[PDB]
Amino acid sequence: IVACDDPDFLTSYFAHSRLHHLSAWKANLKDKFLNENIHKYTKITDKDTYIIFHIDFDCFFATVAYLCRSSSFSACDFKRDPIVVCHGTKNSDIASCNYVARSYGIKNGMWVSQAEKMLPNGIKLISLPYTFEQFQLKSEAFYSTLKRLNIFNLILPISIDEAVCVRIIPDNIHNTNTLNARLCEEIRQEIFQGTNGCTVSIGCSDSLVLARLALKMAKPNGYNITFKSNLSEEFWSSFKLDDLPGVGHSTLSRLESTFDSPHSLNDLRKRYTLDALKASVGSKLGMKIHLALQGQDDEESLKILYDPKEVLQRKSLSIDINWGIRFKNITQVDLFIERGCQYLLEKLNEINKTTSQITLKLMRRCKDAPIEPPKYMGMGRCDSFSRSSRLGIPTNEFGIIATEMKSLYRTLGCPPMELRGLALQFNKLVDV
DNA sequence: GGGGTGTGGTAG
DNA sequence: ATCGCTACCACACCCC
């Protein structure tokens, strides 16, 4: 066990943290895109007619972890057994669950202890360990296959297991659903072959928002072609409110409050007005949802097609550690901040930037919260505090940055024993 | 309008 | 045990 005051803590935590991997992978894919396409000026204009193929692996970690499993799990069956990927056996996050598990209401992000409860008697949850190197290898095969096809004007990385692929259609070429369906079947077979048995699903549409919804409809192991002209009651009735991009749990609560708890997006489509939406969830998000219900992309969403090189540029850099934070005194907190700053500065130097503004943010145990929460080493319920500082001159100097971060910690007035998380942020980045 | 800071939501 | 990251938007609120 590597404690938070051990010099190896950050390394160990990031080696084990799947959410660290998700973010680091996305950042590296964006950086790859910027390097690979430096002499490929294949950005979309609003003149162009295009088709979107939104492609992602089915239950990615579970599939890959299953295919690469040890001989101890040789008889375990992906099509018949509920299978999850996680670290532990009780209050440990299910990173990915297969579609058998999902038939019982098990979801990604549920703790194993919750998921076990949802299975009937006679049915055992199979837990597999993370295989991070294999996740990366399968992703490499995925992106290689997409490039090798030589069919997309733009391949935009969304995650380790997910890409938005854009085909521009000339005016003189007539594109048909048959051609679109053949391409879906080609991609699916080629990825299945190239990854040695992982499945992908594909949503195919003439808008980003619809391609994403079509993808959800296609899962698992399928494809769906739904263009704006094909929108129907049956389609919209297949989706929950938080199936919309940008709508998570908090926005869902607001929409259920305002619109008398619509069961599906069809119910919301029947009941809403634009003015009422905007009042429920704000001007920008309201317009996004309204446009989404017509199968249309908001202007913010379209920027990634119109200028991907600008959109994928990194504008800030940070680390977040809100697990395993148990410090006894301020000396240890300071040493940890120093280690974090050292880490961040290596990243800042790799991208040849300086920073002109930094923030320290912390999580402090809520007054009424137990000293140790149900998840081992978890932050539990906390209040956040943050403070920022502008640096006179842009810098990458440890002496300046680490000293200011430590000073920021002191200003926030959190006793070390109550600290449950720290984030160190470089908010503004500057060239050379 | 120009400038600023702190908090919280979402995606993967 | 268990590994609750992190970029970036939107917003509420302050100043001249």
Ligand SMILES: Nc1ccn([C@H]2C[C@H](O)[C@@H](COP(=O)(O)OP(=O)(O)OP(=O)(O)O)O2)c(=O)n1
């Ligand atoms: N709450 C989550 C969500 C996702 N992931 C990781 C594991 C997932 O396998 C991977 C990709 O996420 P997706 O949301 O596409 O989820 P899956 O690929 O697991 O399932 P789906 O078949 O729903 O796409 O990211 C995670 O660790 N925790």
Ligand SMILES: *[C@@H]1c2c(cc3ccc4cccc5ccc2c3c45)[C@@H](O)[C@H](O)[C@@H]1O
């Ligand atoms: C940790 C977890 C879970 C649910 C929520 C819900 C709302 C949250 C708001 C802000 C922070 C936060 C941090 C962790 C959370 C949150 C929130 C559960 O899905 C589960 O217990 C997770 O492990």
Ligand SMILES: [Mg+2]
């Ligand atoms: Mg997915």
Ligand SMILES: [Mg+2]
């Ligand atoms: Mg997936």
Ligand SMILES: [Mg+2]
């Ligand atoms: Mg994904």
Ligand SMILES: [Mg+2]
């Ligand atoms: Mg959503």
